[PDB]
A = this chain, B = another copy of it.
């Protein structure tokens, strides 16, 4: 099954037996995609064990997979197991169950519901300033991932459940941990046949206590909102309701806080960009005025900085869809069962599409130059019917933190500040050493 890309004429690295090309992941997913982007051109294929993966970079071919042929062919992502009761998660659901959950959780982040969350986040935006002021008046570098993690936890636990927590961050911080050095997930890539061995016999990849604590915490949350929508629509099951809460809690904590740490690093390493951003926030909101829903979307340089950070640090790295039947798109034959992959990290730094892609230049997303950006090359939230469902929720929650903090504090690098920031050469997109900076009031 390792002569597939040799048959279809698609170039790619030579695979090893059983392993395939997973030994090239020693530098990470990002470095392997960028080296293959230069060696084999626009389209190449490799093997994650015995699973063939076709990598595409053509925007028209990307649009056909993500948007056009979504509901028809490229509907589901790579099979991820064994998950146990987490098989009902919207991000892991497949075919008919996904559409029922996508439509059920779509009214969660409308313009009406997002406008209701502004006063709720406005409460947590004050404790963030008061806690940073304790570390500001005292010469002491702040681990931004910590203080932003608590801010990211209170927002998703209140805007989705109405419960104020002020053990969840400890249990949530230990939900993923996708380390390729761990032979377990390196085995699932090599042994896709061991997934049915653990599904019929009830074995999961997530630790029991991070799933038992959340299944019992959601039951305490069930005091008869995003939770209010899942009860009024309840045919939704009770155990299925827990699986969706784990997805929202983890995304609202890990994704928003890690990107916020990426933003503050770029602002501290580029003073003229942070200073120009502070002058704009003081103009739209003078005297440290509380931000509203309209003043957030009005700040465009705030949008030009966030969109530039998401280009440099796409926490997704890759988008994946599984070909469910024999098709031919843009004059290329993709057989059934092939995982079509779109290297987001490699495309966000393609010299063919970006000038000086290494350097932090928010001028790429200016309304004068944003017309030169392909929407299928810059996909930090994906695209099509199966993109990020909390895209507008994440872009709002991160900007609300950037407004309220830059109105009161200014960030400078420290001695222990890793410059340049080296990304984690492992699995998920994170810095090697934690992001630490000095806070000046």
Q: Which residues of A contact B (CB under 8 A)?
A: 63, 68, 71, 110-112, 283, 297-298, 368, 371-375, 392
Contacts and interface: CB of A to CB of B under 8 A. Distances in A.
Contacts of A368: 375
Contacts of A112: 63, 375
A297 B68 CA distance: 14
B298 A111 contact: no
A112 B373 CA distance: 10
A375 B111 contact: yes
B392 A111 contact: no
Nearest to A372: B297
Contacts of A68: 283
A298 B373 contact: no
A372 B296 CA distance: 12
A297 B373 CA distance: 12
A110 B392 contact: no
A389 to B, nearest CB: 12
A117 to B, nearest CB: 15
A383 to B, nearest CB: 10
Given A63-B112, A112-B375, 10 more contacts: A68-B283, A71-B298, A110-B375, A111-B371, A111-B373, A111-B374, A111-B375, A297-B372, A368-B375, A371-B392
Contacts of A373: 111
A392 B283 CA distance: 30
A179 to B, nearest CB: 36
Contacts of A63: 112
8 contacts: A71-B298, A110-B375, A111-B373, A111-B374, A111-B375, A112-B375, A368-B375, A371-B392
Nearest to A67: B112
Contacts of A392: 371
A379 to B, nearest CB: 12
A110 B368 CA distance: 14
A173 B112 CA distance: 38
A297 B111 CA distance: 20
A298 B375 CA distance: 18
A112 B62 CA distance: 13
Contacts of A371: 111, 392
A357 to B, nearest CB: 19
What 7 A-B pairs are tightest by C-beta distance, nearest first? A112-B375, A111-B375, A371-B392, A71-B298, A111-B371, A111-B374, A111-B373
Nearest to A68: B283
Nearest to A368: B375
A292 to B, nearest CB: 11
A432 to B, nearest CB: 36
A242 B263 CA distance: 44
Contacts of A283: 68
A184 B111 CA distance: 44
Most buried by B among A71, A111, A373: A111
A38 to B, nearest CB: 22
Most buried by B among A63, A71, A110, A112: A112
A315 B297 CA distance: 31
A330 to B, nearest CB: 14
